[PDB]
Structures are given as C-alpha cells and as structure tokens.
C-alpha cells in the first residue's frame, strides 16, 4: 500500500457573481454604484436577478461581485406592456 496521497480542490465563486441582465426601464431610475440618472431608449442599464440592483452597463464591472446581502427593506415594482395584431 502506502499509495494514494492527493486532494485540494479550489475555484472562484460563481455564486457571488452578479446576475445583472440588460433591460429597459419605464421610469427615471438612478444608478446604484455611481448614482446618476439612467437614460437611454434600449439597454439603458442593468438589473440583477437576486439583488435587483440597477447599475450602468459600464458600472457593472466596477460593482463588487459581492452579491446576496440581506441588509435591505426597500423593494420596487415591475410593470408590463401589451400589444395587438
Ligand atoms: Zn446582484
Ligand atoms: Zn453608474
């Protein structure tokens, strides 16, 4: 015997990563990182799916991967549109 000595897995944390998704807004929202009015017609900014944090497309890179904090009490609402053929 005396064989079989190894072990030590390691990897980044893909869970902490932000799930920001490029989406449009209907109201004048302000970034969460820098804090500046978010203008634009299509793909104005980005919004997470876990922390629903609105941030600029270029701000997402600056925002700290740190995602999943339970230190918030505010929660916005989502709207929907209709169509016809
Ligand atoms: Zn997030
Ligand atoms: Zn920003």
Curated annotation (Swiss-Prot):
Subcellular location field: Cytoplasm; Cell membrane; Mitochondrion membrane; Nucleus
Start-end of Phorbol-ester/DAG-type zinc fingers: 17-67
Family indicated by similarity: Belongs to the protein kinase superfamily. AGC Ser/Thr protein kinase family. PKC subfamily.
Function as written in the Swiss-Prot or TrEMBL entry: Calcium-activated, phospholipid- and diacylglycerol (DAG)-dependent serine/threonine-protein kinase that is involved in positive and negative regulation of cell proliferation, apoptosis, differentiation, migration and adhesion, tumorigenesis, cardiac hypertrophy, angiogenesis, platelet function and inflammation, by directly phosphorylating targets such as RAF1, BCL2, CSPG4, TNNT2/CTNT, or activating signaling cascade involving MAPK1/3 (ERK1/2) and RAP1GAP. Involved in cell proliferation and cell growth arrest by positive and negative regulation of the cell cycle.
Oligomer status and interactors: Recruited in a circadian manner into a nuclear complex which also includes BMAL1 and RACK1. Interacts with ADAP1/CENTA1. Interacts with CSPG4. Binds to CAVIN2 in the presence of phosphatidylserine. Interacts with PRKCABP/PICK1 (via PDZ domain). Interacts with TRIM41. Interacts with PARD3. Interacts with SOCS2.
The protein's name in its UniProt record: Protein kinase C alpha type
Organism: Homo sapiens (Human)
Gene this chain is encoded by: PRKCA
Shown segment, full-protein numbering: 93 to 169 of 672
């Amino acid at each position: 015997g005396s064989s079989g000595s190894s072990g030590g897995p390691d990897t980044d944390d893909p869970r902490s990563k932000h799930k920001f998704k490029i989406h449009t807004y209907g109201s004048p929202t302000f970034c969460d990182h820098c804090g500046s009015l978010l203008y634009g017609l299509i793909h104005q900014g980005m919004k997470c799916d876990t922390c629903d944090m609105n941030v600029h497309k270029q701000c997402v890179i600056n925002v700290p991967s740190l995602c999943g904090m339970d230190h918030t009490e505010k929660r916005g609402r989502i709207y929907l549109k209709a169509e016809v053929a």
